């Protein structure tokens, strides 16, 4: 729509437009250690962004929803070459991507684009802060509940009993987000279901509240 | 430094806050934007269910109090900003910032670096808070302080801030006594030493 076409207009630099890319569920968009080459704009689906820290642990930093920008921190920084993030297609994803150097060029004396970028960084901050609340819980049960509520907000569809998260969710993908094992998540969701707090239909979780 | 002045010249009150004093409260609308000149600011977020959790430690040259505007929460912040140590800062009414973001082309470009820095600081608190044991959380938090406020040492890195056990506990979500005993254990192991209420980390490595 008009918003998307605007992004094309603000990103034109006399070479390629932003490219459409699609990724299947659970496919990696970019790996830590890989050259940080492109900036991404999420059109459909959910992206799990994680960071590999200095001691080497990988931790989810954000569950990015449609309209988010990512892969762009390096450009806004000093040092640039090497990605320390892992981006994964949490669900099937469609996005736009452009070389970092194109973004850097397009930003040049372009208040409209830097304002779009500012809103993007601000959304990234808010989403990272949601993961803070999730991971601050020392018990896995509460992390799982907080994570489900992120998904309710990002992808939830109202219904009689509550809110249906509008994605087919694997237990392993959930475990990876919250730093648990697939086995634990299956146990916890079973506990939640037996307590009548959630129901599951065709792999879509409905949270009753 | 020169960059912070640059952000300001695009966009008035000088204020000081003593240690632990609140700069702004959650539930209050965003009234001003703040440029931090001296000291440390602890930003925390109040979440829907009512828990308050640290989201960033801000150091000199940070700009804060503007996020809420950029995200449509000008009418009621869910952030709490506190002088983690005694602070000095410059502030401006948010209406003037709003005006500048709409007139001055170069302004939002100059703010991208500040927001990027905020993301990186929030991600450090992610790594700290994801630790389920308080000992690891404390150590991670001490390392954040070493990066953000550390001064190179023959002994190692000295965190150049005078911090109370209670302020540390609040930041990492622990009790005062837990932090006291953990710092005690770290001193017994020679991993840190404390002189004139300043912590030196001997090998952050
Ligand atoms: C295509 C690869 C380069 C990415 C830079 C694009 C910046 C996108 O910016 C975004 O555009 C959306 C649509 O209007 C908005 O709704 C967002 O709030 C905004 O941050």
Swiss-Prot record, chain B:
**S-S pairs:** none
Keywords of the record, alphabetical order, are: Activator, DNA-binding, Transcription, Transcription regulation
- One Pfam short name: cNMP_binding
UniProt xrefs under InterPro entries: cNMP-bd_dom, cNMP-bd_dom_sf, Env_Response_Regulators, HTH_CRP, RmlC-like_jellyroll, Tscrpt_reg_HTH_Crp-type_CS, Tscrpt_reg_NtcA, WH-like_DNA-bd_sf
Q: What are the residue boundaries of the HTH crp-type domain, all occurrences included?
A: 132-205
**Among its keywords, does the record have Ubl conjugation?**
no
Q: Which CDD domains match?
A: CAP_ED, HTH_CRP
| Coiled-coil intervals, chain numbering | none
The residues the entry assigns to the signal sequence are none
Task: State the DNA-binding region(s).
Answer: 165-184
Q: Which PANTHER family match?
A: CRP FAMILY TRANSCRIPTIONAL REGULATORY PROTEIN (PTHR24567), REGULATORY PROTEIN CYSR HOMOLOG (PTHR24567:SF65)
Main function: Required for full expression of proteins subject to ammonium repression. Transcriptional activator of genes subject to nitrogen control. Has affinity for the xisA upstream region. Binds to a 66 bp region containing three repeats of the consensus recognition sequence 5'-ACATT-3'.
Q: What is this protein called?
A: Global nitrogen regulator
Give the encoding gene's name.
Answer: ntcA
């Amino acid at each position: 729509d008009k918003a998307l076409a605007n992004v094309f207009r603000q990103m034109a630099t006399g070479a390629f437009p932003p490219v459409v890319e699609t990724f299947e569920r659970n496919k990696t968009i970019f790996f830590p250690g890989d050259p940080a080459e492109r900036v991404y704009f999420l059109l459909k689906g959910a992206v799990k962004l994680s960071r590999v820290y200095e001691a080497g642990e990988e931790i989810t930093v954000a569950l990015l929803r449609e309209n988010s920008v990512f892969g762009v921190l390096s450009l806004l920084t000093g040092n640039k070459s090497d990605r320390f993030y892992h981006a994964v297609a949490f669900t099937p994803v469609e996005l736009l991507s452009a070389p970092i150097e194109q973004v850097e060029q397009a930003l040049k004396e372009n208040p409209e684009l830097s304002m779009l970028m500012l809103r993007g960084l601000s959304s990234r901050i808010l989403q990272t802060e949601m993961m803070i609340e999730t991971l601050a819980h020392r018990d896995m049960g509460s992390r799982l509940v907080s994570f489900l509520l992120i998904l309710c907000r990002d992808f939830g569809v109202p219904c009689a009993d509550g809110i249906t998260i509008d994605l087919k969710l694997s237990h392993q993908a959930i475990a990876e987000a919250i730093g648990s094992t697939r086995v634990t998540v299956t146990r916890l969701l079973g506990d939640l279901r037996e307590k009548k707090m959630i129901s599951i239909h065709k792999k879509k979780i409905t949270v009753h509240k």
